[PDB]
Design a protein around this ligand. Structure first.
Ligand SMILES: NC(=O)c1ccc[n+]([C@@H]2O[C@H](COP(=O)([O-])OP(=O)(O)OC[C@H]3O[C@@H](n4cnc5c(N)ncnc54)[C@H](O)[C@@H]3O)[C@@H](O)[C@H]2O)c1
Length: 177
């Protein structure tokens, strides 16, 4: 459950997203309230109260990914994916991914770790999230091969099913290429 495409390393990992080390860790929030949701909470606790200040002070809107520093996370930046409510969810994911990965070229990011975005509450189906997540990652690997990137998909330990889907999607993908 890891593979290298050109200058891109991609790994599936069972752990907590807020306990990661990477240039960038991806948050997943409702923009009206970043104190709600599994990932948003984990991150808010770990990163500390000062993370919610820079976040409320920099929303001021079509911004799909808000960027902050990492505070007490072992990261340089946090990319907060903002799920706005007036959009198709599979499209928000697909667009939030590309932006997050484009920002990786913008900020000379070498490593980025993402949770299983959009699987919360069964909003996007597990295989579809995985389909989309790999889709965009692989796209980037082909379209910007000059940029070295380590991408982790962090799956929560108890979420065995989500894990089984990402393995399978990765398997499927490597069978090509
Ligand atoms: N308004 C909506 O219709 C809508 C749609 C999508 C997302 N959202 C917002 O985003 C969140 C839900 O979407 P999501 O799926 O990106 O987020 P989430 O916070 O529910 O987590 C999504 C997935 O990541 C897993 N996960 C990975 N690492 C984890 C960790 N360290 N702790 C806990 N869970 C972890 C979760 O169990 C789940 O499978 C909520 O905050 C919600 O407001 C809202």
């Amino acid at each position: 459950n890891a593979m290298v495409v050109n200058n891109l390393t991609l790994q599936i990992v069972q752990g907590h997203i807020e306990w990661q080390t990477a240039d960038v860790i991806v948050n997943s929030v409702n923009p009206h309230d970043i104190t709600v949701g599994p990932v948003a909470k984990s991150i808010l606790q770990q990163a500390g109260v000062e993370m919610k200040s820079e976040f409320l002070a920099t929303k001021a809107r079509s911004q799909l990914v808000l960027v902050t520093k990492g505070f007490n996370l072992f990261c340089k930046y946090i990319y907060h994916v903002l799920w706005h409510s007036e959009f198709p969810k599979p499209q928000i994911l697909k667009h939030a991914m590309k932006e997050c990965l484009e920002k990786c070229i913008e900020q000379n990011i070498t490593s980025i770790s993402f949770p299983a975005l959009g699987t919360g509450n069964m909003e996007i189906k597990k295989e579809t999230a995985a389909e989309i997540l790999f889709d965009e990652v692989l796209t980037f690997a082909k379209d910007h091969v000059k940029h070295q990137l380590t991408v982790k998909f962090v799956i929560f330990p108890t979420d065995l099913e989500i894990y089984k889907a990402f393995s399978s999607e990765m398997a499927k993908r490597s069978k090509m290429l």
